[PDB]
Design a protein around this nucleic acid. Structure first.
Length: 252
DNA sequence: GAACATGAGAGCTTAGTACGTCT
DNA sequence: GACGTACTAAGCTCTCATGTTCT
């Protein structure tokens, strides 16, 4: 509601959001837009989400919004909370003979002639939006309208990460991160039938070009984040190990 | 040489459009 | 409005290719 709206969730939830296909992502943020982040949820609480509002907010033709809503709804239905793994120690305790379920969604339905979707969260997810207001750094806040406009898995993830690291509330913010921790943050990876990781742009200069730049481009182009740059932070002999990202944000 | 920065693009998937339709 | 259809732009992942520097 309105265009300077903010959504807020526990840091522990970032990875789950990053995993979501763009459409589900979209419906998820809309749902959060509807939430007073500081209070509990009525538990038996239903969220109508309207393609109309999506469209207006994401600057997308309504036709698409209808599609994306319906589809995002399906996908969200399937989606689970991605927890790893001592972070699961937290959750278990927080939430306390019955079982642990990691679905984001308890119930969901599009209304085919009616231009909207309805939705109900599971108790599990609740602690990730009902959120005793300190300590400030347990949380990520972002701008709903930026979140919605992004249209790239990498773009979004980067935007979130940056936001996650937006502590100062004044001019120049920055952070250090390792290439792989980044790739993990961006979901620039896969697996397959063997267990372990498989990174997506194995040789950096190609990664930098096909992911980091394109990404940085679009953020600058579609968001409040005014400047974003990054530099090699530490040696690594010849190879590249850690980047320092800097960024300023428009308070407008 | 082993690491980077660049770029054109192949081949294939997804995000987006215009536009007709019908109370 | 709330689509469905039919098409285009844009996005993804990896590969050839031309060149530069590191330390």
């Amino acid at each position: 509601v309105n265009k300077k709206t903010k959504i807020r969730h526990r840091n522990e939830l970032n990875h789950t959001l990053a995993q979501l296909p763009l459409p589900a992502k979209r419906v998820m943020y809309m749902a959060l837009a509807l939430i007073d982040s500081k209070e509990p949820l009525e538990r038996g609480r239903v969220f109508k989400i309207r393609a109309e509002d999506l469209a207006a907010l994401a600057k997308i033709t309504p036709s698409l919004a209808y599609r994306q809503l319906k589809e995002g709804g399906k996908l969200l239905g399937a989606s689970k909370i991605s927890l790893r793994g001592d972070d699961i120690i937290a959750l278990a305790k927080e939430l306390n003979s019955e079982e642990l379920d990691l679905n984001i969604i308890e119930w969901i339905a599009y209304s085919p002639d009616e231009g909207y979707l309805s939705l109900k969260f599971t108790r599990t997810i609740e602690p990730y939006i009902s959120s005793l207001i300190g300590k400030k750094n347990k949380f990520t806040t972002q701008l709903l309208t930026a979140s919605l406009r992004l249209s790239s898995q990498y773009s979004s993830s980067l935007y979130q990460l940056i936001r996650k690291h937006y502590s100062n509330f004044k001019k120049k913010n920055y952070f250090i991160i390792s290439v792989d921790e980044l790739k993990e943050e961006l979901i620039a990876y896969t697996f397959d039938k063997d267990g372990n990781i498989e990174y997506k742009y194995p040789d950096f200069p190609i990664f930098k070009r096909d992911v980091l730049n394109k990404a940085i481009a679009e953020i600058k182009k579609k968001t409040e984040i005014s400047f974003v740059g990054f530099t090699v932070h530490e040696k690594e002999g010849r190879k590249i190990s850690k980047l320092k990202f800097e960024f300023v944000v428009d308070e407008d």
